Each structure stands twice: as structure tokens, then as C-alpha cells.
Amino acid sequence: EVNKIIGSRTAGEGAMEYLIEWKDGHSPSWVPSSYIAADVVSEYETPWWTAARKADEQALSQLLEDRDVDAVDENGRTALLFVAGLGSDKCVRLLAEAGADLDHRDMRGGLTALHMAAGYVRPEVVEALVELGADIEVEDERGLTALELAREILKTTPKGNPMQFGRRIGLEKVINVLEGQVFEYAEVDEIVEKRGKGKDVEYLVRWKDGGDCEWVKGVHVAEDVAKDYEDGLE
């Protein structure tokens, strides 16, 4: 009766349907996962989950001719979440190309691919994730955005040797790639008031483009416009 599987497709919610081909001979038809043999499903998906958990790009390239890329595992992780935590910017760029849901959320912890690239410390990956338009703002079960995460871990990286080093670099590169997304450096019209003293000086800032004035730490301002201010003071 049933010959082989040839396609997947998300029906309902995290529920699956496969495209079957036939030995009795008739035109290939869609059919619920709940309605088809274990191994025959397993035989279509295992080559897939192997490929991913080892970030095999070539393989993945082929196993996609007609496949629903956002298939989940036991913990609601899609293929993408894997290649992300492994640090394969090349894979990630490929599955993105395949329309994968960048903003997908797992069900053990509530994470996205950027929570993986973050946690697993893959900069060049995040780089790409953001390039292709991911949303950095997505929180998880712990309420953490991806950035707050890189902040937290780097709190607790070791300071031992050049092994424990490329770790610290990593978190910084991520934490800065991410910052360069939350934070712009917009030009100042005027600097209205001065608070704090010496170095911990905090300046009240008027924006050229519009809207409120706001206390920027004296660090997060320009040495050229901070001077222009305390000169008008004298």
C-alpha cells in the first residue's frame, strides 16, 4: 500500500501531515501523521534530524525539495534552533532562504534561535540572524531577551587561559552586535542640563529629530558636544 514519504506540511498546530506515494500506483496524497506507521514517518524524519544536529549543509540542501522546514522535535525545537546553537551561519542562511520561522519559539524554556546563538556563543551566526531580520525583542520563560542573556553569562565566564578567552570575546561580539540594534547614536540638538559630578556626569539631552529630552550617562555622549556645553558654563 504505502511506498515512501515525499513531503511534510504543518497542519493545525505543531501537528503534521506527510505527502505519500503509492505502490498500488495512484496519485500521491496528503495524510495526517497520526494516521501513518511509526517507522515510515521515522524513516523520513531521522535522516533530517541527524543532518541538523551536525549542521550538514549539503544534506539539508537536498532534503528540502518538498519539506516543511519548521518541523518541531520533542521540545518544540525546529531544525533552525539546532544549526544556530552549533554556530553554522551557512546553514541558518540556507534555512532562512527556505522561509524558516526565525522568530520560532521552543517549548522547553521558550527559546528562539537567537537565544541559542547567544547561549552557545555564536557571533557570526547572530550577525546573520539579525541580518535576515530576526526580532531581538522576543522574551522567553525567564523573561530574558537574547541580549540580556549574553549580558548575564558573560557575568560568569572564567578568566583563565586563551581557551577561556575566545569565550569572552564571543559574548562581547554578540553583546555588541545586539546592542548595535537596541541602541542608535542619534545627533544632539542641545544639551539642556547637567547632573552627576566629574565622570559619572549625566547630561540632559535634546534630540534634533524630535521628542523628549533624556538623561544620558556622560560616557554615552560625544567628547566634542560635552565640551561645547561646559564651555557655555565657564
Binding site: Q181, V182, F183, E184, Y185, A186, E187, V188, Y203, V205, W207, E214, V216, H220, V221, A222, E223, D224, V225
Partner: peptide, 13 residues
């Protein structure tokens, strides 16, 4: 990590 000339850090909106 110095701020560009004539600018200051804010959140993106």
C-alpha cells in the same frame, strides 16, 4: 567605544 561626533546613545524607536 567612543560616541560619534555630535551624537549620544539612545534606544531605537
Amino acid at each position: 567605544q567612543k560616541a560619534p561626533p555630535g551624537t549620544a546613545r539612545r534606544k531605537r524607536k
